[PDB]
């Protein structure tokens, strides 16, 4: 297809403060959301039906992530901890203590025996899921860490920071393998590996998304047209149908680009505040979007391609 046709299917209301992150479970059945209201909520991925609320953090939550078997969640909070949750029982299995300030981002590795986290304290930490202990503390950046993500086989971690850098780390050794810098270094607000593992996608607070060949250290694609000068907005690869780049925006729209041509192919209208988070369903052409304090809702969109 040349262009997708995402249309609003469901609006999910429940959070009483800004939503911070939405993520689809790997098995495609659920959507998890985190919020400044200190809560995690679980929703049906296909019907938007509210399932349950998971509570325990003492301050707002910035991020949530699923284990590969869709049974566990990890959350990152302003209370300087991460928590590991058994979704079915709602129980907090482990509280990960070590960061000295706000935890902003988190992710399981594919094996899901490890968690990576990034914090306002400018460090990246690697945790053992089963013991809950910190295995490594990486002196990753000189400003708050905005995102952390494992590659397809968990051998690498990419981190981004307001210091303008993206860095690639060897999971096993903790060594910094790459530092990525273009002709300028505006604050990097988000980063993640592509599904095929060949690229990273980085958002900078100069209204720009960039596709990098991280190995060769070269910028391949640039995506613009949206607004992003303040917030750490999640961006995504959509690969279930047409090959798109998906991101939120500070003009309250969801932006969708053709990955190859860099052309904007759709702008999704509906939210009434900054779209801070987007997520792409693992098998269906479905997008979840979430907005900040003046909106508080999550929206589910579906396309035929």
Ligand X SMILES: CCCSc1nnc(C)c(O)n1
Residues at the contact surface with ligand X, assessed by CB under 6 A: 46-47, 194-196, 237, 239, 243, 284
Q: Which is nearer to ligand X, 211 or 292 (CB)?
A: 211
Q: How far is the CB of 286 from ligand X (least distance, A)?
A: 8
Q: How far is the CB of 114 from ligand X (least distance, A)?
A: 21
Q: How far is the CB of 205 from ligand X (least distance, A)?
A: 23
User: What is the rounded radius of gyration, in angstroms, for the C-alpha atoms of the chain?
Assistant: 17
Q: Which is nearer to ligand X, 123 or 160 (CB)?
A: 160
- Rounded to whole angstroms, the Cα distance separating 192 from 298 reads 22
Q: How far is the CB of 196 from ligand X (least distance, A)?
A: 3
User: CB–CB of 115/75 below 8 Å?
Assistant: no
Strands of the sheet containing 244-247, edge to edge, are 235-238, 244-247, 254-258, 264-268
Q: Which is nearer to ligand X, 127 or 193 (CB)?
A: 193
Q: Which is nearer to ligand X, 131 or 196 (CB)?
A: 196
- Rounded to whole angstroms, the Cα distance separating 22 from 58 reads 20
Q: Which is nearer to ligand X, 95 or 194 (CB)?
A: 194
User: CB–CB of 105/146 below 8 Å?
Assistant: yes
- Rounded to whole angstroms, the Cα distance separating 243 from 145 reads 28
Instruction: Indicate the residue whose CB is closest to ligand X.
Output: 194
Q: How far is the CB of 283 from ligand X (least distance, A)?
A: 7
Q: What share of the chain is helix, strand, coil (3-state, %, to 5)?
A: 0, 50, 50
């Amino acid at each position: 297809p040349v262009k997708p046709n995402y249309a609003l299917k469901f609006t999910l209301a429940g959070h009483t403060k800004a939503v911070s992150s939405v993520k689809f479970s790997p098995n495609g059945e659920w959507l998890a959301s985190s919020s400044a209201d200190k809560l995690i909520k679980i929703w049906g991925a296909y019907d938007g039906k509210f399932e349950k609320t998971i509570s325990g953090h003492k301050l707002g939550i910035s991020d949530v992530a699923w284990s590969s078997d869709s049974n566990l969640l990890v959350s990152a909070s302003d209370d300087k901890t991460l928590k590991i949750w058994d979704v079915s029982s709602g129980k907090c299995l482990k509280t990960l203590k070590g960061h000295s300030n706000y935890v902003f981002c988190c992710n399981f590795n594919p094996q899901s025996n490890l968690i990576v986290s990034g914090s306002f304290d400018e460090s990246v930490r690697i945790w053992d899921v089963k013991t809950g202990k910190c295995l490594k503390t990486l002196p990753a950046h000189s400003d708050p860490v905005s995102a952390v993500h494992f590659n397809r086989d968990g051998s690498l971690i990419v981190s981004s920071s307001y210091d303008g850098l993206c860095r690639i780390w060897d999971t096993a050794s903790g060594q910094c393998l790459k530092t990525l810098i273009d002709d300028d270094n505006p604050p990097v607000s988000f980063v993640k590996f592509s599904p095929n593992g060949k690229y990273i996608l980085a958002a900078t607070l100069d209204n720009t998304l960039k596709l990098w060949d991280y190995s060769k250290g070269k910028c391949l694609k640039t995506y613009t047209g949206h607004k992003n000068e303040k917030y750490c907005i999640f961006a995504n690869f959509s690969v279930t149908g047409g090959k798109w780049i998906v991101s939120g925006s500070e003009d309250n729209l969801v932006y969708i680009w053709n990955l190859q041509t860099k052309e904007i192919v759709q702008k999704l209208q509906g939210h009434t505040d900054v779209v801070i988070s987007t997520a792409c369903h693992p098998t269906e052409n479905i997008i979840a979007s979430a907005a900040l304090e003046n909106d508080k809702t999550i929206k589910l969109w579906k396309s035929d391609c």
